[PDB]
Amino acid sequence: KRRVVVTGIGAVTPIGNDAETSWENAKKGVNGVAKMTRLNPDDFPVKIAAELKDFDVEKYLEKKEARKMDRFTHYAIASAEMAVQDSGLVIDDSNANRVGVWIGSGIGGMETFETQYEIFLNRGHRRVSPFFVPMMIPDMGSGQVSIRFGAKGINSTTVTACATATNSIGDAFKVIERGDADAMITGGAEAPITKMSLAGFTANKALSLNPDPETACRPFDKDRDGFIIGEGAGIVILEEYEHAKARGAKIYAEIVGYGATGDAYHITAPAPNGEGAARAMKMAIDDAGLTPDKVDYINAHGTSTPYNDEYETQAIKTVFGDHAKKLAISSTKSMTGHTLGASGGIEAIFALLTIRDNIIAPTIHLKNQDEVCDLDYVPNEAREANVNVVISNSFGFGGHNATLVFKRI
Amino acid sequence: KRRVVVTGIGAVTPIGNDAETSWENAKKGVNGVAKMTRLNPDDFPVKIAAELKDFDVEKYLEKKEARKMDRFTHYAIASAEMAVQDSGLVIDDSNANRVGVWIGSGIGGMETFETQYEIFLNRGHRRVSPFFVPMMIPDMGSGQVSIRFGAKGINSTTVTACATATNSIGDAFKVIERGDADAMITGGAEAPITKMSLAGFTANKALSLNPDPETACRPFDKDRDGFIIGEGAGIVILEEYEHAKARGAKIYAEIVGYGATGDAYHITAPAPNGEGAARAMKMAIDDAGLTPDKVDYINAHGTSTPYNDEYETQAIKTVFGDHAKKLAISSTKSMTGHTLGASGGIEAIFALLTIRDNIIAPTIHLKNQDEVCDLDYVPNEAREANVNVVISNSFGFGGHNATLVFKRI
């Protein structure tokens, strides 16, 4: 088995149009949730969202090229560009076959589907764009990123709802571990702030109806009542360790563990007691050859729903036992909102920079202690702490549980 | 590394509502393409399709349950049920954590999206179904199959257009090979015969406009002029070899190789010369530890487009050299049509049964020999041949190349 390290990061999030700005704002407790502007809030029961602020696709694509891509692909391209540049990796004819792409999206180009189907209904089938299919399908992130950078290794896309980016990064990790690539551009992207997405998640009763952006998203708080929808992308460059050292790559950390399990319980509700989530975390630390006491920080899934935050706490107690009270946990979704398929990529990056800076970003808005959620969620204020081993959890709708482990190197 | 075998098959296809019927009809050269009935052909420029014939979801689901699933998930459930039953594998509390699901769909629940968005427009956001999101997303196949069978191992979905099922099976193969599951329910499902799908593929100029079902689909024929859309699903049970022997499982063959590469060329057009497809085939046989001369039969991607069939022939010549003329090739899409994300699952099954029966199903409708496509495509009539090693190719839109290798055991 090959060792695998992270040599580049890139992200666009509701708290920054690059990874470093996002992380600086996360450490400051900046709230990315605000009154919705992508859609008219007067026309929906949900009035708030976590949107990108002043994101300009023209910094990465010509207008003509951008028109042939959905927003979610804009975010994948921007984040991949920043990650590739950050990594200094040169992809040329000599290594292109050994550099792949594994970028997921949970729902893909929903805005494109809405726009093109309206054209179909109002103007006829002949007026549908020749690029409708490629623009809508969730693998267009990987497809476009592969073309942009000349990456000729495996070109794939995992789609597992909120776990999309975490599974994708884990799957890319396994590609390198087994020797089938020397580098991977990997993560997730999501642009789910659309009228049908809002209508569907509202019909499913998944979204908080609290219109106050200062209290709506409050993971692990007694008064939480649903998730807040966000958007963006998070991409990392994974690289085989000897390859990285040979070129002198800057290394953020080593990726050492991947756990993935299924609840086999219900299509949208997570399983009682965090049964499957616990097995995913344990599988991930077992994959890393580490005992539970070695984990210093958990970047939680922590979506601010009644079930998730309860079940995730219970799963953490199951896996970590007496150590559950000793480690630190935080949900950065308290600041970014729930970016769905992108969340694991953004949060993997935050977990990596927690190692770098030895600072844990807080769970903001945590004001009312819950009797069940009684662990240490780093409420409200960032905390300095020696962090050497981190895990990032995504326990997504559909029973898709995924955990990644990163370790200082 | 663990060895991995196939212990169950299940499929619904345009030439049979079970795998054995489909394969018997494939060996007989039965044409599954006919005048379209799912949609009104008088309302579209494409008049033909490869539809399931007399498929009844009520044999697998109660009416109330079926109403909460898109057609593509109906096909995944039916095929998974038949595959699990065929395998005799018992999934209970003692092994549920070691049985996973990796089922892909290329476009997911497009019909559901069409229906629910029309409700949104005509009746308001409040009338959208609470199950819209789960029904539409492509991972609902895996999600529902996991619940149905109690499979608590990895629960994932790869989405790579026409390569979806081939990548999914390969990814599941790698899970077992590295020790992370003892069995996997894996493959692909697609229900793409919808008005927006037709409109999009027609706008992209990908579909043949030939309305004659007896000549429209003709892979490798000089007069081919686009693919013909089909539907269905193909699922296999992969199982770790020692686990299979310990319970006396019936074994169809061993899965020994998986190749996956990217063209990095264009979002819909395949790369000239089959450059990436060749690397995927070579990677797959290298993974199997076999030289090119060991391959007896190629179940081609063979979609009946000008570029694909040409480029695939060129890639085969690149990989197999002097042996390219000696092995046998056939496209069973000549009979099933192009079932998109399901194709690799259906075709993996056909490749497995080619080993079992030592009979190669033909490329039907191959009447006019092409100067470029001059290999042996088993035209028109099935052929008896000693087949011990087979490969199945999917070179899908978006630059997603995937190949699987199966070998007699």
UniProtKB/TrEMBL annotation, chains A, B:
Q: Which GO terms describe its biological process?
A: fatty acid biosynthetic process
Enzyme nomenclature, EC number: 2.3.1.179
Keyword Translocase included in the entry's annotation: no
- Gene Ontology molecular functions: 3-oxoacyl-[acyl-carrier-protein] synthase activity
UniProt keyword terms in alphabetical order = Acyltransferase, Fatty acid biosynthesis, Fatty acid metabolism, Lipid biosynthesis, Lipid metabolism, Transferase
In the UniProt entry, which residues are flagged as the active site? Answer: C162
Checking InterPro entries in the record gives:
3-oxoacyl-ACP_synth-2 (IPR017568), Beta-ketoacyl_synthase (IPR000794), Ketoacyl_synth_AS (IPR018201), Ketoacyl_synth_C (IPR014031), Ketoacyl_synth_N (IPR014030), PKS_Beta-ketoAc_synthase_dom (IPR020841), Thiolase-like (IPR016039)
CDD domains in UniProt: KAS_I_II (cd00834)
Domain of life, per UniProt, equals Bacteria
Involved pathway(s): Lipid metabolism; fatty acid biosynthesis
- Which reaction equations make up its catalytic activity? (9Z)-hexadecenoyl-[ACP] + malonyl-[ACP] + H(+) = 3-oxo-(11Z)-octadecenoyl-[ACP] + holo-[ACP] + CO2; a fatty acyl-[ACP] + malonyl-[ACP] + H(+) = a 3-oxoacyl-[ACP] + holo-[ACP] + CO2
Give the top-level enzyme category. Answer: transferase
Example of a GO cellular component annotation carried by this entry: cytosol
Ketosynthase family 3 (KS3) domain span: 1-408
Q: Which PROSITE patterns match?
A: KS3_1, KS3_2
Describe the task this protein carries out: Involved in the type II fatty acid elongation cycle. Catalyzes the elongation of a wide range of acyl-ACP by the addition of two carbons from malonyl-ACP to an acyl acceptor. Can efficiently catalyze the conversion of palmitoleoyl-ACP (cis-hexadec-9-enoyl-ACP) to cis-vaccenoyl-ACP (cis-octadec-11-enoyl-ACP), an essential step in the thermal regulation of fatty acid composition.
The text of the family note is: Belongs to the thiolase-like superfamily. Beta-ketoacyl-ACP synthases family.
- State what protein this is by name: 3-oxoacyl-[acyl-carrier-protein] synthase 2
| Lineage, opening ranks | Bacteria, Bacillati, Bacillota, Bacilli, Bacillales
Gene from which the chain derives: fabF
